[PDB]
Amino acid sequence: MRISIFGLGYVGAVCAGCLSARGHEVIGVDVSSTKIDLINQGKSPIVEPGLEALLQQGRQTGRLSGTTDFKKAVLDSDVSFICVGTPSKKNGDLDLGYIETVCREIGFAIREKSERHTVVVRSTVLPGTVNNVVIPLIEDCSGKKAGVDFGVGTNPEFLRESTAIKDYDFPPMTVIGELDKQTGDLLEEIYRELDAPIIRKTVEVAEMIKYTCNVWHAAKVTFANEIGNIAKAVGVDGREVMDVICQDHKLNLSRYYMRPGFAFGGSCLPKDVRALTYRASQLDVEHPMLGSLMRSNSNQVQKAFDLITSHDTRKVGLLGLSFKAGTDDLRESPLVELAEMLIGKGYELRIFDRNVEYARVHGANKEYIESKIPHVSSLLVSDLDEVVASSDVLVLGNGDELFVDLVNKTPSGKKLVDLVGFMPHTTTAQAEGICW
Amino acid sequence: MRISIFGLGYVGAVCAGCLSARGHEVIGVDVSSTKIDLINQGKSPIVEPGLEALLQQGRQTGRLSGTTDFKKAVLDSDVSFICVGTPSKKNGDLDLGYIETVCREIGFAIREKSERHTVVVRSTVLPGTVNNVVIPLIEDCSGKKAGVDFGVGTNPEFLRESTAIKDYDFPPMTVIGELDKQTGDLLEEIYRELDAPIIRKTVEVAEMIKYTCNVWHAAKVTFANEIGNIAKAVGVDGREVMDVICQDHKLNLSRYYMRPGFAFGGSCLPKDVRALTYRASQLDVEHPMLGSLMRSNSNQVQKAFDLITSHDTRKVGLLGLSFKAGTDDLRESPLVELAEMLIGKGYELRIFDRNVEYARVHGANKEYIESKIPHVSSLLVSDLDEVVASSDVLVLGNGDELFVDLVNKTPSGKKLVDLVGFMPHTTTAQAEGICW
Numbered sequence: 023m024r025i026s027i028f029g030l031g032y033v034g035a036v037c038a039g040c041l042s043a044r045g046h047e048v049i050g051v052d053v054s055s056t057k058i059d060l061i062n063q064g065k066s067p068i069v070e071p072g073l074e075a076l077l078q079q080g081r082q083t084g085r086l087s088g089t090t091d092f093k094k095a096v097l098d099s100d101v102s103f104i105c106v107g108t109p110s111k112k113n114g115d116l117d118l119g120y121i122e123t124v125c126r127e128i129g130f131a132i133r134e135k136s137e138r139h140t141v142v143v144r145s146t147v148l149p150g151t152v153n154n155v156v157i158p159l160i161e162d163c164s165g166k167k168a169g170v171d172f173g174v175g176t177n178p179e180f181l182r183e184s185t186a187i188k189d190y191d192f193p194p195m196t197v198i199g200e201l202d203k204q205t206g207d208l209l210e211e212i213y214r215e216l217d218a219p220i221i222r223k224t225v226e227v228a229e230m231i232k233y234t235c236n237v238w239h240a241a242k243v244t245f246a247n248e249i250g251n252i253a254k255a256v257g258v259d260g261r262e263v264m265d266v267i268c269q270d271h272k273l274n275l276s277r278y279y280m281r282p283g284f285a286f287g288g289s290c291l292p293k294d295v296r297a298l299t300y301r302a303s304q305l306d307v308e309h310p311m312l313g314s315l316m317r318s319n320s321n322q323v324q325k326a327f328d329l330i331t332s333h334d335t336r337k338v339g340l341l342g343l344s345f346k347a348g349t350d351d352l353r354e355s356p357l358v359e360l361a362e363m364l365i366g367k368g369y370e371l372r373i374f375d376r377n378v379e380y381a382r383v384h385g386a387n388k389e390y391i392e393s394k395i396p397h398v399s400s401l402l403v404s405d406l407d408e409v410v411a412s413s414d415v416l417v418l419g420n421g422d423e424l425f426v427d428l429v430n431k432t433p434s435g436k437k438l439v440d441l442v443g444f445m446p447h448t449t450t451a452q453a454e455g456i457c458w
Numbered sequence: 459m460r461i462s463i464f465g466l467g468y469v470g471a472v473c474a475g476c477l478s479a480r481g482h483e484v485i486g487v488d489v490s491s492t493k494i495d496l497i498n499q500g501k502s503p504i505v506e507p508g509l510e511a512l513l514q515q516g517r518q519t520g521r522l523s524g525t526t527d528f529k530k531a532v533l534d535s536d537v538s539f540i541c542v543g544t545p546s547k548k549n550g551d552l553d554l555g556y557i558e559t560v561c562r563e564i565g566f567a568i569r570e571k572s573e574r575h576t577v578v579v580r581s582t583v584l585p586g587t588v589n590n591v592v593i594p595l596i597e598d599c600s601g602k603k604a605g606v607d608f609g610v611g612t613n614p615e616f617l618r619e620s621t622a623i624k625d626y627d628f629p630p631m632t633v634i635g636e637l638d639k640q641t642g643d644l645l646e647e648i649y650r651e652l653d654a655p656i657i658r659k660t661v662e663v664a665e666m667i668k669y670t671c672n673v674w675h676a677a678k679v680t681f682a683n684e685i686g687n688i689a690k691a692v693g694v695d696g697r698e699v700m701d702v703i704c705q706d707h708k709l710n711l712s713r714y715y716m717r718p719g720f721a722f723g724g725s726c727l728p729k730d731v732r733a734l735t736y737r738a739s740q741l742d743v744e745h746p747m748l749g750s751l752m753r754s755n756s757n758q759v760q761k762a763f764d765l766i767t768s769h770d771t772r773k774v775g776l777l778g779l780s781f782k783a784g785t786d787d788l789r790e791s792p793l794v795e796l797a798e799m800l801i802g803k804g805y806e807l808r809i810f811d812r813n814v815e816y817a818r819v820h821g822a823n824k825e826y827i828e829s830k831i832p833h834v835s836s837l838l839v840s841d842l843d844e845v846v847a848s849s850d851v852l853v854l855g856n857g858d859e860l861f862v863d864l865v866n867k868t869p870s871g872k873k874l875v876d877l878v879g880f881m882p883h884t885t886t887a888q889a890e891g892i893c894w
């Protein structure tokens with residue numbers, strides 16, 4: 023395919039090299055005549071292993087060239103990848119300056135082009151950027167309309183500097199933000215041979231995925247460092263500790279714990295976080311990230327409370343009370359906390375939990391339930407149908423499979439607040455999720 | 459084996475069921491008459507799938523029993539597991555109250571026994587607890603010596619409530635904290651049949667591993683929730699976003715980013731963290747964890763500075779300047795930041811980086827290197843041997859393979875500050891790690 027790439031930096035030069043190596047005819051575009059001149063000499067503008075060879079190969083086969091003539095580039099290509107910078111503004115916000123300039127240029131360029139052109143944003147931009155910035159600018163400069171006249175989509179990159187070519191060749195996945203199907207199909211064709219999933223999503227999901235990947239990488243580093251600092255302070259090797267953590271692919275390096283939802287609770291996570299951070303404090307080890315967990319957690323409880331109390335009714339049914347489905351353990355259950363908040367605010371609360379109800383009859387926790395939290399346990403209702411019938415707002419609190427039916431076919435006149443993820447789709451007038 | 463278990467709660471009751479089901483003679487000890495009575499009836503004190511059957515089986519076969527008689531329990535077993543509570547004190551610190559009484563009880567019971575007994579702590583306790591609390595109390599009350607007269611070890615548990623039996627049967631790994639070899643060997647024999655690695659470390663490392671696992675789990679949930687909250691605010695399904703994150707087993711769900719070391723940097727992580735948190739703030743989405751990353755990161759830079767300047771010399775050699783080995787990219791490099799801190803405080807700094815040295819004269823970043831940061835780049839030295847010979851403190855800043863030789867064969871009269879992990883072992887008088 024004929025392809026134009028806007029921006030020949032750390033990302034764009036690699037893409038240019040990798041695409042031309044696969045047989046595409048690539049025209050690199052940059053405002054920097056320094057970078058353009060190097061590329062036309064088969065020279066890498068950066069230190070990146072293997073890049074110079076790919077650029078050399080591209081010039082020799084006539085499949086790679088560099089230019090500042092953006093109009094010609096667009097006229098001579100089927101698709102333009104935007105790979106320009108999105109640096110921070112002074113205040114930390116996303117600087118759209120370069121994206122804006124390129125969009126105007128591309129719009130001017132396609133104004134009289136009679137073949138359908140396609141624009142693909144590889145640069146990392148926030149959700150909303152394509153709708154509110156890219157499309158309007160291109161549409162205003164071209165006199166054409168997105169979709170029918172020109173294709174638009176996003177295609178984030180996951181390359182790491184120093185291993186960019188290997189990362190391109192063997193990525194974890196290809197992510198496509200799709201508006202019109204033609205562009206999505208075009209991108210699928212370009213990446214089709216890679217051994218990784220092609221994931222097509224809305225533009226907004228695609229961009230959120232990119233940011234989430236990068237912030238996750240940052241969170242991982244930060245976690246390893248804070249733990250490392252604590253380990254050193256207690257006289258052990260932080261690398262040894264993290265090495266063992268990384269041998270666990272069931273809980274540590276799996277998708278478990280990675281579902282957006284409600285606060286964590288139970289008899290161990292809260293106390294163990296408090297104890298480790300307490301010890302770190304005693305040892306003069308600052309730990310901003312580890313020290314933020316409990317506050318964030320409490321914030322999530324408040325968030326659920328705010329969703330529940332936003333409905334002009336006092337009749338709340340709480341589905342689940344112990345900290346997890348399948349256990350009766352009430353210790354530091356966020357659902358108990360939520361229940362107590364509701365009771366404190368005068369709500370008419372009914373609660374269903376088959377595990378806790380069972381525990382009132384069989385088990386060693388009867389005294390806790392009847393004497394320690396009587397204000398809450400007295401609100402237990404043994405019949406799920408009754409909780410549903412007599413409540414207006416139903417809160418899906420933990421993962422009991424018995425709550426599935428209620429979500430699949432909700433009686434009329436009820437509002438659901440989903441803290442776990444039972445909902446098949448996003449928030450509607452009758453059902454709202456805490457993170458969807 | 460003959461095993462006694464102290465504490466028949468959520469963890470202990472499960473261990474009692476699973477050990478007796480494997481053919482061991484198990485004597486469960488608790489101060490709660492309620493729990494003991496239930497065990498003796500073959501009844502579960504808790505709602506935990508499959509547990510009651512195991513307890514029934516243990517009573518039927520005559521392998522399981524419960525008692526408050528701690529002395530007799532110890533006399534009639536060869537190993538005691540401690541599974542008592544370790545709840546928070548009011549201040550968030552670890553409450554050692556239950557472990558202290560159990561240690562005294564066990565200590566008095568072993569005084570009454572000539573044969574060698576073995577004590578294994580399964581309860582989650584902070585690094586240092588076994589050496590500073592458990593051992594002294596057992597020794598004091600028994601008048602005997604740890605390791606020599608009685609076996610001592612730790613064996614953290616990784617069980618989740620509601621899936622505890624499945625987790626016992628199919629754990630990610632078995633972790634053993636070891637003092638005397640006999641106890642380590644005994645624990646290995648108990649867990650040999652399981653399909654998972656057996657990891658034997660010092661007691662402190664074992665204790666640290668357990669905490670790190672739980673705080674990691676807490677961090678995972680918190681990350682998912684904060685991202686979810688942002689996702690909902692931008693009109694997207696947070697679950698859809700995280701589902702895609704979890705499809706990446708190369709960067710997201712791998713060990714990459716999980717090594718303790720230095721601050722993250724480069725042209726993308728910092729700016730993307732800043733942009734996402736900025737947007738979250740605009741959308742009134744609180745995000746304590748995500749909002750803590752940059753501060754923790756800057757703290758790590760300060761930590762390195764502190765180690766470097768602790769040596770009473772001004773001659774510093776910095777090995778690595780760009781943000782990663784194998785690239786010349788200086789954008790938001792933590793090593794450049796560190797260099798500037800050192801220059802600002804009057805240090806005699808020499809810098810080695812083969813990539814920046816190359817880029818300074820070939821490529822597209824020359825003007826930045828020569829005109830923007832000459833106060834740093836002018837300190838570049840071509841010969842690694844020269845930076846080494848002329849400096850007193852050498853800082854291992856990024857992962858260049860060239861630095862390996864310096865670490866394995868360090869010339870006399872140097873102090874190494876390892877920010878990466880080149881050191882084979884922990885901190886010594888001549889070499890210190892940022893997290894080891």
Ligand SMILES: Nc1nc2c(ncn2[C@@H]2O[C@H](COP(=O)(O)OP(=O)(O)O[C@H]3O[C@H](C(=O)O)[C@@H](O)[C@H](O)[C@@H]3O)[C@@H](O)[C@H]2O)c(=O)[nH]1
Nearest residue numbers: 179180181182183243715716717718719720722723724726
């Ligand atoms: N302490 C520590 N730091 C680490 C570790 N692993 C990496 N780092 C650091 O994390 C930073 C970023 O490195 P890396 O992610 O390897 O490279 P890069 O920043 O070029 O790539 C990331 O941004 C890309 C991008 O947005 O363009 C992404 O595409 C890419 O996937 C990465 O997330 C660097 O400061 C690293 O030193 C670790 O285990 N421990």
Ligand SMILES: Nc1nc2c(ncn2[C@@H]2O[C@H](COP(=O)(O)OP(=O)(O)O[C@H]3O[C@H](C(=O)O)[C@@H](O)[C@H](O)[C@@H]3O)[C@@H](O)[C@H]2O)c(=O)[nH]1
Nearest residue numbers: 279280281282283284286287288290615616617618619679
């Ligand atoms: N939001 C969200 N919450 C989650 C997710 N997965 C689990 N949770 C929650 O995380 C909390 C802890 O649950 P879990 O770890 O499944 O069970 P438990 O707390 O019994 O076990 C943990 O502590 C044990 C222990 O110390 O005894 C550990 O052994 C064990 O591995 C766990 O870390 C609960 O509040 C859960 O609801 C998720 O994907 N998203």
Ligand SMILES: OC[C@H]1O[C@@](CO)(O[C@H]2O[C@H](CO)[C@@H](O)[C@H](O)[C@H]2O)[C@@H](O)[C@@H]1O
Nearest residue numbers: 639640641642643644645646647648650
């Ligand atoms: O150490 C000698 C003695 O120990 C036994 C068990 O008591 O074996 C243990 O130690 C061996 C050597 O380290 C290990 O290979 C083995 O796994 C462990 O049980 C006896 O086999 C031996 O006589």
